[PDB]
Ligand binder design. Sequence first.
Ligand SMILES: C[C@]12CC[C@@H]3c4ccc(O)cc4CC[C@H]3[C@@H]1CC[C@@H]2O
Ligand SMILES: C[C@]12CC[C@@H]3c4ccc(O)cc4CC[C@H]3[C@@H]1CC[C@@H]2O
Lengths: 221, 218, 8
Amino acid sequence: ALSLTADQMVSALLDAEPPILYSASMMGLLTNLADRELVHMINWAKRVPGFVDLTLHDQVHLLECAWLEILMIGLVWRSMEHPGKLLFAPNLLLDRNQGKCVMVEIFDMLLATSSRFRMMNLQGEEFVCLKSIILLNSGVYTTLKSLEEKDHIHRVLDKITDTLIHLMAKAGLTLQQQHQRLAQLLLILSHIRHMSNKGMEHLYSMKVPLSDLLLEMLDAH
Amino acid sequence: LSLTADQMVSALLDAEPPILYSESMMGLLTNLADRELVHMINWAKRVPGFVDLTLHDQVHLLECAWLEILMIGLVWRSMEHPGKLLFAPNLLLDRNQGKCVEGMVEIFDMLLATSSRFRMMNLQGEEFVCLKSIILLNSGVYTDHIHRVLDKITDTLIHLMAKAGLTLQQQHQRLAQLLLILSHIRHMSNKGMEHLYSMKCKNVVPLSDLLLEMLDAH
Amino acid sequence: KKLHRXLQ
Ligand SMILES: C[C@]12CC[C@@H]3c4ccc(O)cc4CC[C@H]3[C@@H]1CC[C@@H]2O
Ligand SMILES: C[C@]12CC[C@@H]3c4ccc(O)cc4CC[C@H]3[C@@H]1CC[C@@H]2O
């Protein structure tokens, strides 16, 4: 399906982008927001090139595995313009000290990641690539028939990688700088995984009431 | 950073920690990991740029990455043993021996799946020591000089693939695939850390003071 | 402090 050009892939992800939603009691605000973002994420994943080519069983597995990572990289992205603060919503800009209300360790890492994106001057075209990478890669390591689909995910991942390199090449970066920047971005995904696992364990230890969908995404971990 | 790509590889290969033997399943694994940590500390000191960092940063990096390093080492040792995890030459565990400990078999499955991934990618020893050094340096950043060393290992990885005969497109594609595995290695570590802390709170096995401190940092 | 001492 993905025999799209590099910029065809970019504009496909850009158009598939979900909107920025508005929003003890702190846990209620964050979990209700995440719940409403989950629905938009599901339909976003469907518009990711090569995702609907997978079986429903495998689409579920990938979403259950990466949902908090996807929420976190989204948060970190829209928080770049607000140093030392996390923009969960336009009407919910939270500072570090407000993390002590529940979690401040999780806030710190999210803030450090948002700062890291600023120092790299992360572009929107690169962001949508990274988020689609997370979706497809986070759960890939978890018969020939089942082999060919893992191979499919691998091919799409290579495609998005080509797209990231294309963006850096277009940006006028030298060949060496492309390799280094690509490496830096993908290494940040490791930290995003780290924050996800920590946030997941936190959400579980907090188990304010949660919705059916959110309980299910949590129960997967 | 004043090292060539070949000097970087050779230094990392030469700094490789020894394969230890095992001396209550959790007891054997705990005892092994504890003795390995000591050899990991000396290994880290031989990683180009690590001793240049402040001692506080050296502590923080090892505290955050110690389980990742043990796991990727384990995964590397088990590459020639499909369906098995070689914790030690005298401790070759099949998948089903993970059932011996509560919530251990799903950790094994991820470790076994990682080994098969390295196997399918035909991971080389030169690439392995690079990946392990990257883990040590990157896994504690988001908690200047570090990033310039990380860019050096990136250049080294590319040099290897270019020397291995991979086209320019295959290089950054394989580079991406290798680094995306570190995300899964990160995932396994966090799950292993939660499991290890679970065993400590249930008094399943006694932990050395070194390991206690490793858990406390998480 | 523990680890702090094997890097002496
Ligand atoms: C999952 C938590 C509540 C929901 C939070 C959220 C909610 C919405 C969102 O877009 C991103 C995040 C990331 C941090 C999450 C929190 C980390 C711990 C807490 O349980
Ligand atoms: C840390 C655990 C015990 C020690 C195990 C070990 C022990 C030695 C080693 O070289 C690698 C690993 C990785 C898996 C580890 C286990 C995962 C969960 C368990 O707590």
